[PDB]
Structure formats: structure tokens, C-alpha cells
């Protein structure tokens, strides 16, 4: 719950570097826990 | 092995399926014969020689043993020339575990209904034994 | 507990979560194989604690 | 008599045509009085049995006497509402029924002491408090989410912001979110006629923070009247009774830990900030935990955050069918 809020206030925070670095790494961790690259590992 | 467990995991303190051996061998050497119905006395000198692991540890818990056989219904009724193994050793194993009536003190037909209930189809064999 | 308390906050109509935890309750009520083990050691825990409290 | 059918049918008739207008305002109870039994109502039949901590939303005008209402119950029909003014003559017509209601008792004492009744014995005395039967509230509710810590610290604010977040998307073009940044619970309406009216009056209310607070309240009818559901993201309020006195009469969403212990962890999980105010993010839980949960209207008690997301979801479309 605390990880989909941080990504809910980081979305609506840049919408208005260091920053734009961990946008890729939430894309990451969302796509590390999908099915999807569960099957294919 | 699981046909047995409930005697492979005995805790042996509370133990009814081996007490009952002692009383038949106690009551045999005393009886010669069934007969119907046997004396009083022998009953007291029986629960001195019964095992102490069910029925009296030490002076005091005797005092208990009265409890049980005074303050409540008496086979006195009848007969004192009547047998009281079928109202000393139901009471004595009703009485060890799970205890209701003395809590309550009134509701007895409860709980002999819910035997009778249990005891459906025996013939109606213990209906003479409850007593 | 939860659709239990789902009712209570609708107040304002009569509520149908009752019914549906109901029927949802039954069906897989039937799915307690209770083995034999698992009988003897709830005896037994049964017998210990009171044993334990009564001292 | 012709004169009361025709009066009947002339407010049949305008029941019909008032069925699909606009809603007026909506008043707010704290007594369990029925609107049917009651004889002196126009139209038998059609009256609202209501109980107390209850919504009742009037549309049209009637007269001093009584109003068209409505019931925020599904299906509940248009009923008449008993005027403010007439339940004040039906609770004097309640205490009336009595053998004796003002000082001169019954105890074997007939003939002796006549005592007439003084002014003490009407509705006039007894105004230390004197609560209206009538309270004036916002039509739609507004939502307020309270728990499970102290707010203004991130794991309160992260908690709230993803159903915040969950609202504004599902139910968007339909709910406005409003932020309170200032304070909320100084809401007072029988204080005194007007504290602070201006501000050049220099004075101590004046120059203080009750003015904007004050002003922000009829914000919210604003929104209210709108028929557009509301809610508050307001800082300062951690606990339902600093906002159960006033006007708001929200809804208020319990959002908690199942125990301390997660918590603990949780707060941990921030990182070395939070721990400086990990003692007091913990007494503002468990104060909050023993308040009774009648005093709350919902309650998320799970984990997982879309079964959670869920439980506002149904009882807000509940809510919404209610009122339509």
C-alpha cells in the first residue's frame, strides 16, 4: 500500500537528474512482480 | 498406529480403560457368585483396596469420595441388600471428567436424558444400571 | 467478521451482505477433514490447559 | 368536508409535480419523532417515521408548519417533515401528557397548593444550552479520513493519499477533493452573535485564526449544494470527537493497523526521520484505537489495499443510490 502511494505522489509531483532515475527503477520493481517475468524466469 | 493412538498417548493419570481391569479383578475375588445383588460394606473396604490413581490419593480427597456418595440421589431407595457397582463406578468416571451435575445441584434429568439419547440402542440394559 | 460488519454501516436500506455471507459460509464448511492427529492433539491441548489452570 | 379532500389534492398534485425538481437544503435531528402518526400533517399516509441521527432533504415550501422532505433511505418516498416551530409545540405536547410537569407535584397534594404555571413552566427558562431540534447541515457529506497515525507524517500521508488517489480516479466527474490547510476545529455556532466580525477591530478574535476557519465552513455547504460529493483533507483533526460537535456532521474513515506491532515496523520502514517522532506517533494510535468504533462510520481494518479499496467503493455506491 505505502509503495502505490509513493508512486501515486511521485507521478502527480513531477507533473506539476537524480529524480528522473527512479521513475525507471519503480518501472522496474513493477515489472520485476508481474506474471509476465515470472513465466519467462 | 492410529488404530491405537488413544492408548499411545495415554498421559497415564486419568486412565479408565485399565482401572476397570482392577475393579473386576477386585469385585471377582470378593464374589463368588453373581447372585442379583450383593452386601453394603464390602463397598468401603473395596474403595480402600481400589487403586489410588482413581478414586483417593491421599486423606483428604476421601472427604470427596463422601461428597460422592452422600449429597445427591441415594440407591437407598430400594433394597439395602442391592449391588452399587452400576451407581459407584459410573459416578466415580462421570465425576473424574467432564463434571455438570455439581455445579448445577438440579438439572440431572438433563443430563440423564442426554445418556439415554447416547445409550439409544443397548438393548435397555443400563436403564437398570442407572440407577 | 468483515461482511458481518459490512451491513452495519448501510443503515439506510436493508442489506444483502448477510445473505451472501451466508450462502458463502456452507460450501466450504465441508472441507474440515479433521484427521485423527489432529483430533488427539486438541484433546490433549484441551486436557494440558486445564490441567495447567486448575493446577 | 370538501375543503380537506381538495387541500389533499392540491397537494397531491403538487407532490407529482415536484417529484423531479431540484433538492432545497437538508436538516439534521437529534430526536426519534415520527412524521405519519401525527394528525395535523396535510396528507395521511404519507408521512416519514424517521428515528434520530438521521438525514431528512427538503425540496419544495409548504408553509410554517410543515415541509416536503425526503428520506436519504433507498426507496424512500416524499414524505411531510414537521417544521422546527412545530416540533417545539409537539415535544411541550409530549411532557403534557404527564400528570404534572411543572413545580406543583401529585403526591396526595390536590386542592391544597392550585400553583399556576409560571414562566418557568413553559419553553421559555431552561436556555442555558437550549439545542434547536434542528440543525443545519451540508446536503452531501463530507468524507474525512482519520488514522492510523498522526498526520502531516509520511506514513499517515501516504495511506491517505492512495485512497485520495482511488477516489479522484474511480468516481471521477463526480467528487471534487478540497484540501482544509488551515485548522477545522474551532467550528462554534452558539459562542456568541458575531466574535470578529471585522477585522479592523483589532481585537483578540479579530487578528486571530477563527475568522478563516469560520469562512471555510460554509465552503463546504458550498460544495455541498452542488449535489457533488465532497471530502477533507484536513491536517489538524486526528480523532472523530474534535468533529462530531460541530456543523460539518461528516463521514468519517477509519484507516488502522490491526496491531501496534506492525506499526512499529512500518514506521521503521521510512527510514531514520521518522525515528525521532516514533514515541509520539504511537500514543496518537492508541488513543485513537480506544475510542469506541460506533463513534466511527466506516471502518478499513485489512491489509491489502484493493479489498480495502473496495469497502469505500460498494458503500459509497450505496451512498449514491441513496440520494438518487
Known sequence: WIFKAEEVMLAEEDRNFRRKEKMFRFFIRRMVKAQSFYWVV | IMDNFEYLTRDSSILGPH???????????????????????????????????????????????????????????????????????????????????????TKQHQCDAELRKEISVVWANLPQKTL | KLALQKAKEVAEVSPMSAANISIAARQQNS????????????????????????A | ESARR????????????????????????????????????????????????????????????????????????????????????????????????????????????????????????????????????????????????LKGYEVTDMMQKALFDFLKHRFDGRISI??????????????????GKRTIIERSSARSSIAEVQSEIERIFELAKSLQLVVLDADTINHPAQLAKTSLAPIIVFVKVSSPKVLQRLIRSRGKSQMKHLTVQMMAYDKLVQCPPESFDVILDENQLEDACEHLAEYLEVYWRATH
Not at chain 2, 490413581?53 to 440421589?73: E, T
Not at chain 2, 466415580?92 to 467432564?98: F, G, H, S, V
Not at chain 4, 409535480?17 to 402518526?37: D, E, I, M
Not at chain 4, 478540497?178 to 466574535?195: E, G, I, Q
Request: proline letters at 7%.
Open chain 2, 19 to 105: 482401572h476397570l481391569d482392577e475393579f473386576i479383578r477386585v469385585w471377582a475375588e470378593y464374589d463368588p457368585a453373581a447372585c442379583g445383588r450383593i452386601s453394603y460394606n464390602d463397598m468401603f473396604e473395596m474403595l480402600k483396596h481400589m487403586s489410588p490413581p482413581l478414586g483417593l490419593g491421599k486423606k483428604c480427597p476421601a472427604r470427596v469420595a463422601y461428597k460422592r456418595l452422600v449429597r445427591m440421589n441415594m440407591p437407598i431407595s430400594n433394597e439395602d441388600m442391592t449391588v452399587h457397582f452400576t451407581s459407584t463406578l459410573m459416578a466415580l468416571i462421570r465425576t473424574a471428567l467432564e463434571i455438570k451435575l455439581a455445579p448445577a445441584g
Open chain 4, 178 to 195: 478540497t484540501r482544509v490547510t488551515a485548522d477545522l476545529s474551532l467550528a462554534k455556532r452558539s459562542v456568541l452573535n458575531n466574535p
Open chain 3, 31 to 54: 472441507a474440515k477433514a479433521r484427521s485423527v492427529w489432529e483430533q488427539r492433539a486438541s484433546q490433549l491441548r484441551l486436557q494440558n490447559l486445564r490441567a495447567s489452570c486448575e
Open chain 4, 6 to 149: 381538495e387541500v389533499e389534492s392540491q397537494a397531491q398534485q403538487q407532490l407529482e409535480r415536484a417529484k423531479h425538481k431540484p433538492v432545497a437544503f437538508a436538516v439534521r435531528t437529534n430526536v426519534s419523532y415520527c412524521g405519519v402518526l401525527d394528525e395535523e400533517c396535510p396528507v395521511q399516509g404519507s408521512g416519514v417515521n424517521f428515528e434520530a441521527k438521521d438525514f431528512l432533504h427538503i425540496k419544495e415550501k409548504y408553509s410554517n408548519d410543515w415541509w416536503i422532505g425526503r428520506l436519504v433511505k433507498e426507496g424512500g418516498d416524499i414524505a411531510f417533515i414537521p417544521s422546527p416551530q412545530r416540533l417545539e409545540s409537539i415535544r411541550l405536547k409530549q411532557e403534557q401528557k404527564a400528570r404534572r410537569s411543572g413545580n406543583p407535584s401529585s403526591l396526595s397534594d390536590i386542592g391544597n397548593r392550585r400553583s399556576p404555571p409560571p414562566s418557568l413552566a413553559k419553553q421559555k427558562q431552561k436556555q442555558a444550552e437550549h439545542v434547536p431540534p434542528y440543525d443545519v447541515v451540508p446536503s452531501m457529506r463530507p468524507v474525512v479520513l482519520v488514522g492510523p497515525s
